[PDB]
Amino acid sequence: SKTFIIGISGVTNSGKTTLAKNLQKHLPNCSVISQDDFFKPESEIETDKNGFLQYDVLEALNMEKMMSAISCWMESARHSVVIPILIIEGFLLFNYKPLDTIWNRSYFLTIPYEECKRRRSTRVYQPPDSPGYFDGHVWPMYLKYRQEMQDITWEVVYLDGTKSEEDLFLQVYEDLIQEL
Ligand SMILES: Nc1ncnc2c1ncn2[C@@H]1O[C@H](COP(=O)(O)OP(=O)(O)O)[C@@H](O)[C@H]1O
Ligand SMILES: [Mg+2]
């Protein structure tokens, strides 16, 4: 019956998947769900005035399919001990109200504008980032999300994504040992 559910959010390229993976390998009976696995097909993505595909919005995501994956994990978690841990990591978690009571802990990776743009440029997407995509869409949708975070009623731990991978792992691991 009992579970421990962790949210890891933050801007694109802030190290969410990396952190989730480092935690998983050190925590027993731990799983990870990635929001990145639940994008709608390209044809269902809206395009704005400037021709920018709206990927960085809840409407780009099949959150019904994501919820069923979380329910599948819970059912598995029930038979996993003869406390199971789930880590949900993704760029748009904490503004999704159906999940607002799920979080036992809530982490938010932050990196500044320049570093985010730098990392984002080293990654190859499907389809590739158009020129101007970061300034015309990615960063604006991020600031909109941070504005939406201002009415979150529960505690969120903001993490500095420019710290080394191990530094971030230890910081979160130390926090978790104290919460579990
Ligand atoms: N602590 C860190 N410091 C610097 N770079 C990192 C760190 N963690 C991950 N990265 C790198 O930044 C990029 C984004 O990492 P990833 O974990 O995929 O981010 P996200 O899941 O938030 O998109 C990758 O190239 C990855 O190797
Ligand atoms: Mg990721």
Residue numbers in the entry: 1 to 82, 92 to 189
What does the paper say about this structure?
In one pathway, specific NR kinases, including human Nrk1 and Nrk2, phosphorylate NR to nicotinamide mononucleotide. NR kinases are ∼200–amino acid polypeptides related to human uridine/cytidine kinase 2 and Escherichia coli pantothenate kinase. Nrk1 consists of a five-stranded β sheet flanked on one side by α helices, E and A, and on the other side by helix B. Additionally, the monomeric enzyme contains a lid domain consisting of helix C and D connected by a 12– amino acid loop. Thus, human Nrk1 and human Nrk2 are dual-specificity, NR and NaR kinases.
To dissect the structural basis for specificity, we crystallized selenomethionyl human Nrk1 bound to Mg2+·ADP and solved the 1.95 Å structure of the Nrk1 monomer by single-wavelength anomalous scattering. To understand the basis for substrate specificity of human Nrk1, we prepared a selenomethionyl form of human Nrk1 and grew single crystals of a complex of the enzyme with Mg2+·ADP. Single-wavelength anomalous scattering allowed location of Se sites and phasing to produce an interpretable experimental electron density map of the Nrk1 monomer prior to model building. The 1.95-Å refined protein model includes residues 1–82 and 92–189 of the 199–amino acid polypeptide, plus ADP, Mg2+, and 72 water molecules with B factors between 9 and 37 Å2. The adenine ring of ADP lies between Arg128 and Glu174. In the absence of NR or NMN and in the presence of the ADP product, Asp36 stabilizes a Mg2+-associated water molecule.
